[PDB]
Each structure stands twice: as C-alpha cells, then as structure tokens.
Amino acid sequence: SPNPPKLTKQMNAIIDTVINYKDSSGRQLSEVFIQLPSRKELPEYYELIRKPVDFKKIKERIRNHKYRSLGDLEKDVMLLCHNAQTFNLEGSQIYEDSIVLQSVFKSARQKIA
Ligand SMILES: O=c1nc2n(C3CCCC3)c3cc(C4CCNCC4)ccc3n2c2cccc(Br)c12
Ligand SMILES: [Zn+2]
Ligand SMILES: [Zn+2]
Structure with missing residues (x-):
C-alpha cells in the first residue's frame, strides 16, 4: 500500500532541513555531499567505500x-555520514561537517515526528 501522506511529508521536510542547513559561518554544509566524486577522478573512493551514497541518491x-519508515531514511543518511568519516581524515572540514549533518538530521526528525 502507498506510504501514508504524513510519512511522505515528514521525509521531504527532514531532508530539506539537512540539505538547506547553514552553520554560524553561513556555509551550506551539504554542498560537497550532494553528488559523489567521479569514479574516473577518485577511484580510491570506490576502492575504500563499499556502499557509496550521496544526497542525490537519498x-x-x-x-x-x-x-x-523514518528509520529507513535515517539508515541511509547515517551511512552517507559514516562514509565521509571513513574516507576523510578525522578533524578535516568534510569529516566534521558530516558529524554536524548527523546532528541536524536527528534534530529535524524530533521536530516533525
Ligand atoms: O565521503 C565523501 N567525500 C567526498 N569528497 C572527499 C574526497 C576527497 C576530498 C573530499 C568529495 C570530493 C569531491 C570533489 C570532486 C572534484 N571537484 C571538487 C569536489 C566531490 C564529492 C566528494 N565526497 C562525497 C560526496 C558525497 C557523499 C560523500 Br559521504 C562524500
Ligand atoms: Zn510518487
Ligand atoms: Zn558500521
């Protein structure tokens, strides 16, 4: 049976909140994560990351x-952030941005559900 209207509305609002999020410096943190790096330019990404995912795919x-369910969506957002943390150095801007986006996802879910 089709997803109920409440679930559909909730997923759009949560993902839009994550993608549109800007930190105190005014930077949209999701920017680099919208699209995966190219398989031709960065083959090492695909050698190390077993389940690549980006916001375009989500x-x-x-x-x-x-x-x-909201749990199904959360699993893929957490996978995206986990892959960013696996490939990129601890403490790098991209690694730290992915941790912030995990937090933004969780906070947005608490507000709509
Ligand atoms: O884990 C991720 N790490 C990165 N990186 C790092 C590799 C090393 C550098 C950062 C990316 C780099 C790019 C370049 C391409 C060429 N033009 C500039 C930008 C593009 C997407 C990148 N990307 C992701 C994209 C979607 C989802 C995830 Br979860 C990731
Ligand atoms: Zn449809
Ligand atoms: Zn794991």
Whole structure:
C-alpha cells in the first residue's frame, strides 16, 4: 500500500532541513555531499567505500517511495555520514561537517515526528 501522506511529508521536510542547513559561518554544509566524486577522478573512493551514497541518491529513494519508515531514511543518511568519516581524515572540514549533518538530521526528525 502507498506510504501514508504524513510519512511522505515528514521525509521531504527532514531532508530539506539537512540539505538547506547553514552553520554560524553561513556555509551550506551539504554542498560537497550532494553528488559523489567521479569514479574516473577518485577511484580510491570506490576502492575504500563499499556502499557509496550521496544526497542525490537519498532524494531518489524518497521520490520513488523506497523508504517505508523514518528509520529507513535515517539508515541511509547515517551511512552517507559514516562514509565521509571513513574516507576523510578525522578533524578535516568534510569529516566534521558530516558529524554536524548527523546532528541536524536527528534534530529535524524530533521536530516533525
Ligand atoms: O565521503 C565523501 N567525500 C567526498 N569528497 C572527499 C574526497 C576527497 C576530498 C573530499 C568529495 C570530493 C569531491 C570533489 C570532486 C572534484 N571537484 C571538487 C569536489 C566531490 C564529492 C566528494 N565526497 C562525497 C560526496 C558525497 C557523499 C560523500 Br559521504 C562524500
Ligand atoms: Zn510518487
Ligand atoms: Zn558500521
């Protein structure tokens, strides 16, 4: 049966909150994470990261009704942030941005659900 309207509305609002988020410096943290690096330019990314995912793919899964619960969506957002932390150095801007986006996802979920 189709996802109920409440679930659909919740996923769009949560992902939009994460993608649109700007820190105290005015920087949109999601920017680098929208699209994966190219397989031709950065093959080492695909050698180390077993399940690559980006926000474009998460938005595709939301659009095509693939997530059946908020937990399903959370699993992919957490995977994206975990991959950023696996590939990139601890303490780097991209590693630290992914930790902030995990927090933004959780806070947005608490406000809509
Ligand atoms: O884990 C990630 N790490 C990175 N990096 C790092 C590799 C090393 C540098 C940062 C990216 C770098 C790019 C360049 C390409 C060429 N033009 C500039 C930007 C593009 C996407 C990148 N990207 C992700 C994109 C989506 C999801 C995840 Br979870 C990641
Ligand atoms: Zn549809
Ligand atoms: Zn794990």
